[PDB]
Amino acid sequence: XVXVXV
Amino acid sequence: XVXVXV
Amino acid sequence: XVXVXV
Amino acid sequence: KPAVSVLTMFRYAGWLDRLYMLVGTLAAIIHGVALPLMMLIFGDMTDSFASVGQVSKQSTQMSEADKRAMFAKLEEEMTTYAYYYTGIGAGVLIVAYIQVSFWCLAAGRQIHKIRQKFFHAIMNQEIGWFDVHDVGELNTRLTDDVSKINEGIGDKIGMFFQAMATFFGGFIIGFTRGWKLTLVILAISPVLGLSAGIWAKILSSFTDKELHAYAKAGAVAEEVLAAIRTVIAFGGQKKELERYNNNLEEAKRLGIKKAITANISMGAAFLLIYASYALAFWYGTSLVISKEYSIGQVLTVFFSVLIGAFSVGQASPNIEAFANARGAAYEVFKIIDNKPSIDSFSKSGHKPDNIQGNLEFKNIHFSYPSRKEVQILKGLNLKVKSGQTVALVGNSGCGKSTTVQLMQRLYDPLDGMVSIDGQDIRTINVRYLREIIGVVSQEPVLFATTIAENIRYGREDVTMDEIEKAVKEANAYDFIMKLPHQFDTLVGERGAQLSGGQKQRIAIARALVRNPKILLLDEATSALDTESEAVVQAALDKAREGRTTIVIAHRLSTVRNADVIAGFDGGVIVEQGNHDELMREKGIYFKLVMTQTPPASFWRILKLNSTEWPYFVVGIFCAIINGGLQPAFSVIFSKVVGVFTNGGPPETQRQNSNLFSLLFLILGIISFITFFLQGFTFGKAGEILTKRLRYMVFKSMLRQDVSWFDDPKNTTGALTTRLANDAAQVKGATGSRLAVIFQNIANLGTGIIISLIYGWQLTLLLLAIVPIIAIAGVVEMKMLSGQALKDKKELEGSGKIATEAIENFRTVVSLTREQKFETMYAQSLQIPYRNAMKKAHVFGITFSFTQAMMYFSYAACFRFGAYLVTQQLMTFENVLLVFSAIVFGAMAVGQVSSFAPDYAKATVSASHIIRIIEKTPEIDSYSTQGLKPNMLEGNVQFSGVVFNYPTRPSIPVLQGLSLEVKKGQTLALVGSSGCGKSTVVQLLERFYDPMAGSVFLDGKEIKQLNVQWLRAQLGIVSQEPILFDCSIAENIAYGDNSRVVSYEEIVRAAKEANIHQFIDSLPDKYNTRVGDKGTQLSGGQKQRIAIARALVRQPHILLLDEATSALDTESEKVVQEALDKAREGRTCIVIAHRLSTIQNADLIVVIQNGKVKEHGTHQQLLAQKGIYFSMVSVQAGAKRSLE
């Protein structure tokens, strides 16, 4: 939830 | 540069 | 998650 | 476990299918390659602005000169890049469509064939194969497994190859543009992915595995609610509530612990991701300063590689899909590849003409596929002449039926041969054999169509004339013609349920249309009413006369006219001949002859959480700061690449990237404090209200009365379930989701404010694009669910005609016409087939549109970002910021849609949980109102009582019952049967108030009396006493609540109950645990303990409800001794079933239909002659008989 995917 | 991967 | 739809 | 070869699974794909798969996988690989090429160009764009970014800032002398070369470079470059992007868009569109369409088409085309072939295979199996298998499992296996195979060979493969293509395609560019950063990226790989996985795993915690935590309280709750009448009777509700509360108290603590740990875990994971993510970029910059790499190249490789890396995690699930699909395809193909010995779908063997019907069974040994465990037929010799009719008789084993079973060659015999005419049965074609043989069974079956159609299942080619003559020759014409719709009436399991004989007659008519040469009649007359039996018998007799016949039944009314009768013993044929001969034989036959002679607004649930004004503001303020902290990440990355792109003189750069990369991490660590907070504050907030809710629910569940607990709707399990789920569910709504949503709206809010203020009309444009692709993304999923539901409805109809076919199979095989069901199945399938063709056409367009929109949207991004915006003084660094910010906001908004179903479910689960609290009983034990009389001595006046149970207000139990019992005397109560005897005890305890009439104790009406105090004076003892898990002293002390009982007191009670023998014998003695958790005891001890419970209360009224019901031998004696010692000092009512032990009673009272019939002392009821005398005579007759 920052870039790559969380 | 968004969230998938640019 | 409170009353309308999250 | 068991899988299937990869080439076998696609055996039904040929020509166009393989082509579709090829062109599809090709297009899929291209589609895969498409994305990393997009990111490759993204570096070239950066370089374009970078070159100008450096030169623009390097001047500080001339201005107008920079308006020429720079703008021209940007002109040609940006035009080129935009053109390329537009180029990629059309590509991804086309290839996406091709991919999904083709793969789905192949899927459909194959699955169709699979279904057809499989059902054929099912139908082609021999009966022995069915006798060993579960049909339900097989049908469900069909419908469920073929779907799995479908999910397997579907578009999932295309996605797999696409993913592999982004993987390779990503890593290829990643490597070729530079080897270092890739390895440096791979170095940090064995952490980030694991962390992301961990987070994704932790946020799946809402599903019900909480049972492990709750079960402790759940056990208490279950044993309580299962024992409700005892806790009600002894009014220990406050105690049970207390225990439950304690267990909840533990549960919540364990909860908050879990919350702390989980939040720490997630926070740490996030930190690691942040740290590596920043670190890699710092190394990047460290490589850019050395001029080894271009600033854009860094981005290119970074993003290409990370894409390529994520591709694996995103790829993995489709492997499992195909993997599961082989496994499912194993057991399916196993039926299809299987070839039987019998067939019946084969065209082979002789089809003899002019069959005279001379049957003989020669030395037949047989056993059904229970095999060696039992051999029912031990050798055999039987002949039946042409035109004759033989009748088989037997005591048991149904070896009779076996011959009918074999005569159709449902089984081939172990040893021996069955011979129709001269030829062996196994030489003649199966179908033809089945066609020449007619059959009528005990239980007739009708398939669900018109009567004509059921008569048409005898022969496909037939006219209503033949039907008419058929039913008329079965004398079924009248009964059916009286029926409406004529021949077009309905039959089956659903609708038009008819008399058995009628159905049998329809079955005989059906069999009659078959015009067979051989007739087999097994017990068709049996299991039917005597009147219609003759009606059908007439038909059966009329069904012969043109045929040779073997008949079997238990009706020796139908046997006499037979030409030959045949008796079996232990599978051994013995007696054969005409009736008189068999009667002269005086054998088995003679023996048998002689033997037989939702969503709404619920705020109050939140108002209940309002108990905590704090803990929420903290989490929201914190989560809003997190929401404001989130885009700050994007603002940095903007200025990291921004200042480096906007650098100008390089000397100042290397110092600033370090200041940023530091800060880049600083928002990281601070993200650990905030995330853990909002997660811990909301968490602890969840476990507390879960205590309040479950406590307020359970409590109010003890408030309700026996009327509510007898409801079929509410059973212990259902209550515990309702108790667990709702409380578990509301927590999820009030929990993380909310925090996340607020975090997200905050996120998009700060993001949009920043983006909006920085870029003028740059943001306004994007905000026109993003919601359209999002909504276009939601509408696609809606069509997907629609087509899914519609498809489920169509195959449901075809699966319904399959279930009908494979359930009643043993009949369809007898009538053949399996091909009929094949055809019907096919026609049923043909509609889904055409539907599946359209599916691919749609699944493609919606996919390619959402992809193309995302790529074209990206062209507008830089096209408007460049050109009109960059020709103006507005700069690139802000563009890069806005894109990040906005799409971040959106992808955060996505979670809103993702988290929608939780509240909906919670509401429904919250809808129940408030109602259950507000429901009020007719009798409430909690009310402190009531008289609480001061006078001890108890009488009991029942007067004109009428009672019907609220669950069953049909047959009344009490009608005008009237009893009187003085103090200190025993009231025996005898009855014909039922709860009439117990309803007294129930009503005295006041589990119910009677419909009409009333009942007094001290002269005061119990109805106006206090409920608790009333129940407090009662020494109830039931049949099977329930004891809760705890010290037997705690089980005994349960007799008296609101006060702790003394040891010497429970000793005295135990001494009174005569249980002391056990209690002083045990190792633990009075502290021993009972109730199956720690120890086991027989009924006697339990009962004595119940007696102790009863008389420690020192009741004025003992109530002994069939106490010796389940008991035996001396136990009854000792327990009766105790019970006898218990009474005589108190008022009591005894309903025990041992009248020999009631012989000593002050007043015996026979009940009858709710009215007292006979009453008086023993000798008086004995002086009289009537019910009681009979009651005492009959059971005394049994004791005398046992000698």
Residue numbers in the entry:
A (entry chain D), B (entry chain C), C (entry chain B): 1 to 6
D (entry chain A): 30 to 626, 689 to 1278
What does the paper say about this structure?
The transporter P-glycoprotein (P-gp; ABCB1; EC 3.6.3.44) is expressed in the intestines, liver, kidney and blood–brain barrier, and affects the bioavailability, pharmacokinetics and efficacy of drugs. P-gp belongs to a superfamily of ATP-binding cassette (ABC) transporters found throughout all kingdoms of life. The transporter consists of two pseudosymmetric halves encoded into a single polypeptide. Each half is formed by six transmembrane helices (TMs) and one cytosolic nucleotide-binding domain (NBD) along with interconnecting loops and short helices.
Here, we report higher resolution (3.4–3.8 Å) structures of P-gp bound to a series of rationally engineered selenium-labelled cyclopeptide compounds that were designed to probe the ligand-binding pocket of P-gp. The R groups of this series were systematically varied to generate alanine-, valine-, leucine- and phenylalanine-derived compounds (QZ-Ala, QZ-Val, QZ-Leu and QZ-Phe, respectively) of increasing R-group size and hydrophobicity. Consistent with these substrate-like interactions, P-gp mediated mild resistance to QZ-Ala in cells. These data suggest that the binding of QZ-Ala and, to a lesser degree, QZ-Val at the TMDs generates a signal to the NBDs, accelerating nucleotide hydrolysis. Here, four new P-gp co-crystal structures with a series of rationally designed ligands are presented. It is observed that the binding of certain ligands, including an ATP-hydrolysis stimulator, produces a large conformational change in the fourth transmembrane helix, which is positioned to potentially transmit a signal to the nucleotide-binding domains. Thus, we must conclude that the binding of subset A ligands induces these changes in TM4. This ligand binding-induced kinking of TM4 begins at Pro219 before returning to the apo wild-type topology at Tyr243 in the ball-and-socket region close to NBD2. For co-crystal structures pertaining to subset A ligands, the movement of TM4 brings residues 221–228 closer to the bound ligands in the lower binding sites, fostering an intermolecular interaction with Trp228, a residue that has been implicated in steroid binding to P-gp. Specifically, conformational changes in TM4 have been linked to this TMD–NBD coupling, consistent with our models. A new ligand-binding site on the surface of P-gp facing the inner leaflet of the membrane is also described, providing vital insights regarding the entry mechanism of hydrophobic drugs and lipids into P-gp. The site faces away from the transporter, but lies close to the predicted membrane–water interface and intramembranous substrate-entry portal. Drug binding near the EH has been reported using electron paramagnetic resonance on a bacterial P-gp homolog that transports lipids. These data lend strong credence to the proposal of an initial lower-affinity ‘ON-site’ for a ligand near the inner leaflet of the lipid bilayer preceding the higher-affinity ‘ON-site(s)’ within the central binding cavity.
